Design a protein around this ligand. Structure first.
Ligand code: P34
Length: 323
């Protein structure tokens, strides 16, 4: 029966639950879809591939011994590439980080649009273009952009994740609560809305993460926009905006969080203008233009090591221009 959901929401549900986009990504990840289809994909083997990927990372102590386990990974994950380098492990690490959010997407998936919206267990409300919050969101995109592509906001959604507010409740008393970006691939978003924003498992190798396993954020929209993996063919992507209770920040230029700190701030070369900082709802919004800050980073990085420190507030349907 005719759904009463708005068109930008209706079209977003079609986008985040696109079966063809999932199979398309599996082809691009070189995965042999004939020996392992989309359906026969299981979490039990993804987690097993990780514990074998971390064993290749263990081959730091000691070439014939490495390839005996390197090919054993290709036994679990069919491919249609020798894993000995640290770069080779990180590449397959990002693949499994993406594959798991597709296994979650197709698990939920297996009128129809209204069932899928409720399957995600989230309230997605469209934000009007004339609203005050739309100007503040559009200014944050236009001013915190670094120039190889141009960004234009197609839609703004106020996303209310089920059971996230009561989870975020104790961290709301923390100081320095900022509104930061989290960019991810269009396919992962079905899992990001149901399970939420998560941290990498202990099975996964630590080599791939600069500041260890946690939830990574940025103040510059362009930084997170690169993690959308958008091309000339399909330029539409999805980026998030979440309330991150940072509090006591551990400022790093280059173990686990000191007794007293609550977050890590990887200092960068360029920071959004602090004299142009708006404190909307008692939450800092660094929508100023990029000014200069020894630092081994592009721009600033904000990492939290507790899933509850995050409260996903907005969602943006972005269009990418290629010059
Ligand atoms: C630490 N890594 C690059 C491995 C990885 O796949 N994680 C990952 C995965 C998704 C990420 N998304 C982001 O928006 C982001 C922003 C600033 C810094 C990092 C990220 C980010 C990082």
């Amino acid at each position: 029966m005719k759904s009463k959901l708005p068109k930008p929401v209706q079209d977003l549900i079609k986008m985040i639950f696109d079966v063809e986009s999932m199979k398309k990504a599996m082809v691009e990840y070189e995965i042999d879809l004939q020996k392992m289809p989309l359906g026969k994909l299981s979490k039990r083997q993804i987690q097993a591939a990780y514990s074998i990927l971390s064993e290749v990372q263990q081959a730091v102590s000691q070439d014939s011994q490495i390839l005996d386990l390197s090919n054993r990974f290709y036994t679990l994950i069919p491919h249609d590439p020798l894993l000995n380098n640290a770069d080779s492990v990180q590449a397959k690490a990002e693949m499994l980080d993406n594959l798991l959010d597709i296994e979650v997407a197709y698990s939920l998936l297996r009128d129809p649009i209204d069932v899928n919206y409720e399957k995600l267990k989230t309230d997605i409300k469209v934000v009007d273009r004339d609203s005050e919050e739309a100007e503040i969101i559009r200014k944050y995109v236009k001013n915190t952009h670094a120039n190889a592509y141009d960004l234009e906001v197609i839609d703004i959604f106020k996303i209310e994740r089920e059971g996230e507010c009561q989870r975020y409740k104790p961290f709301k008393q923390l100081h320095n609560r900022r509104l930061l970006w989290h960019g991810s691939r269009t396919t992962n978003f079905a899992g990001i809305l149901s399970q939420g924003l998560r941290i990498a498992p202990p099975e996964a190798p630590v080599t791939g993460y600069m500041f260890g396993k946690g939830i990574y954020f940025a103040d510059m929209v362009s930084k997170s926009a690169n993690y959308c993996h958008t091309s000339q063919g399909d330029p539409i992507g999805l980026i998030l905006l979440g309330e991150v209770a940072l509090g006591n920040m551990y400022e790093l230029k280059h173990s686990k969080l000191p007794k007293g700190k609550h977050s890590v701030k990887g200092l960068g070369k360029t920071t959004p203008d602090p004299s142009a900082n708006i404190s909307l709802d008692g939450v800092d919004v660094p929508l100023g233009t990029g000014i200069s800050s020894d630092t081994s980073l592009l721009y600033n990085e904000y990492i939290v090591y507790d899933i509850a420190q995050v409260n996903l507030k907005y969602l943006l349907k972005l269009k990418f221009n290629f010059k």
